[PDB]
Amino acid sequence: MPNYKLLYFNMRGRAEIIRYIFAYLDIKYEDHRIEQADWPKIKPTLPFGKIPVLEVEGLTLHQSLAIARYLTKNTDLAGKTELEQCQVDAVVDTLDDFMSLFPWAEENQDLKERTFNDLLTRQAPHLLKDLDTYLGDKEWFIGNYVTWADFYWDICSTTLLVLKPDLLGIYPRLVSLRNKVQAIPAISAWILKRPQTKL
Amino acid sequence: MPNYKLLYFNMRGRAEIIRYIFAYLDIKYEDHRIEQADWPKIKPTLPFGKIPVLEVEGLTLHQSLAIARYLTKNTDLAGKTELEQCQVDAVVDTLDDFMSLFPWAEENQDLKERTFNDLLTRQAPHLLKDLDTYLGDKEWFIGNYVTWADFYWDICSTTLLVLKPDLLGIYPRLVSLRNKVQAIPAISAWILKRPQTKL
Numbered sequence: 001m002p003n004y005k006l007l008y009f010n011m012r013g014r015a016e017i018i019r020y021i022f023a024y025l026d027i028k029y030e031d032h033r034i035e036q037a038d039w040p041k042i043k044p045t046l047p048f049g050k051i052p053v054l055e056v057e058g059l060t061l062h063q064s065l066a067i068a069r070y071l072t073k074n075t076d077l078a079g080k081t082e083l084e085q086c087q088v089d090a091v092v093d094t095l096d097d098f099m100s101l102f103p104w105a106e107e108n109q110d111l112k113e114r115t116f117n118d119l120l121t122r123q124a125p126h127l128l129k130d131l132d133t134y135l136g137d138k139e140w141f142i143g144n145y146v147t148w149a150d151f152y153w154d155i156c157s158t159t160l161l162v163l164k165p166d167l168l169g170i171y172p173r174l175v176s177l178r179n180k181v182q183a184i185p186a187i188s189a190w191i192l193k194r195p196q197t198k199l
Numbered sequence: 200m201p202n203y204k205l206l207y208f209n210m211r212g213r214a215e216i217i218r219y220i221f222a223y224l225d226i227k228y229e230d231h232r233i234e235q236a237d238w239p240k241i242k243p244t245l246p247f248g249k250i251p252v253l254e255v256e257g258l259t260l261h262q263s264l265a266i267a268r269y270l271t272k273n274t275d276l277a278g279k280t281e282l283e284q285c286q287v288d289a290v291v292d293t294l295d296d297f298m299s300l301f302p303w304a305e306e307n308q309d310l311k312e313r314t315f316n317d318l319l320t321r322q323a324p325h326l327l328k329d330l331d332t333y334l335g336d337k338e339w340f341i342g343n344y345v346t347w348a349d350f351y352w353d354i355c356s357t358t359l360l361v362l363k364p365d366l367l368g369i370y371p372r373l374v375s376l377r378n379k380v381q382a383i384p385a386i387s388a389w390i391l392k393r394p395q396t397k398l
């Protein structure tokens with residue numbers, strides 16, 4: 001129904017969860033991508049000087065997870081009951097907590113590459129085992145229906161595999177889960193048309 | 200109506216936003232506080248091995264902001280419309296993004312004290328000016344009614360003032376806002392009865 005304008009860098013990054021939700025709900029929007037070179041001109045015009053932001057009817061929303069949660073309201077993706085909605089939120093928060101540990105902006109490319117290494121080999125196995133245990137034998141994180149938490153797992157694991165290709169080898173269940181998310185038609189189409197980018 | 204069991208350390212920390220919401224809604228709950236010494240015994244029994252957690256009818260919820268958002272649903276505290284709910288969420292996320300930068304677990308008490316210094320003197324002014332600009336002359340962040348975003352500002356600014364006492368001197372509006380939150384009867388009562396703790 002309404003017109004949407006997503007603004008972010010030409011990368012999956014923080015905006016990708018929003019792009020998945022739009023794809024799934026078949027909601028049209030302008031996927032406005034900017035190059036790093038353009039950022040300096042744009043940054044000062046945004047509320048809290050950061051992206052992504054969503055222009056909705058001339059109102060600029062910010063914060064990717066706040067926007068994702070807003071787009072999924074009164075939708076099954078958010079979770080059917082209030083208890084499930086909290087569980088969906090908790091999983092996205094657990095995954096985001098981890099991805100936030102990565103020093104993506106680290107200037108020192110030595111320390112960075114060395115921290116990435118620690119994270120990927122020391123902490124990840126703990127996150128993965130709890131996540132695996134949580135998922136158990138359910139079809140999706142929450143149960144028998146897909147939620148935006150499952151989308152987030154696909155989004156997060158994609159970048160992580162770019163970092164450490166063999167990261168998921170010991171977790172077939174987590175593998176099957178991301179495979180399932182990727183098989184959903186609306187997502188498969190998006191994945192194929194989406195710009196090939198590293199992060 | 201239902202029985203609640205909050206589990207966390209004896210500190211405001213991550214669980215304080217939940218304690219504010221309970222106080223305001225006048226919902227009874229067991230405020231179970233544990234000492235650091237007990238943590239090792241408890242940690243392995245929790246889903247993702249972290250606190251706070253909320254036991255509701257024998258179901259363990261986790262992630263403070265996921266729980267806070269669940270408790271505030273179908274309540275004015277969450278924001279009246281879907282657009283305002285997104286804005287309330289976004290403010291909480293902006294404030295949490297910042298507080299997360301603080302290396303609270305830093306072993307190296309030199310680096311830590313030195314990073315805290317940087318954050319407090321270089322980044323905070325930027326967060327504070329955007330926050331101030333956002334609030335403008337509204338009574339509360341969202342407008343003419345209190346939301347859990349306002350609670351969060353009181354919670355976050357409390358710890359920050361423990362760090363840098365003169366941090367808010369240049370922002371009278373942000374000061375008036377936290378003073379207003381503190382004047383709400385249910386909050387005033389909580390503040391007075393809550394255990395005096397540093398963080």
Ligand SMILES: N[C@@H](CCC(=O)N[C@@H](CS)C(=O)NCC(=O)O)C(=O)O
Nearest residue numbers: 014049050051052062063064065296
């Ligand atoms: N939690 C926020 C984080 C926003 C954020 O840090 N965005 C970065 C890009 S990943 C940004 O705006 N960088 C440009 C800058 O801060 O100068 C969100 O998810 O939207």
Ligand SMILES: N[C@@H](CCC(=O)N[C@@H](CS)C(=O)NCC(=O)O)C(=O)O
Nearest residue numbers: 097212213248249250251262263264
């Ligand atoms: N974003 C999470 C953070 C959880 C977290 O880091 N909790 C800390 C206490 S503030 C914890 O569990 N510490 C014990 C440990 O990790 O060993 C939340 O808000 O619940």
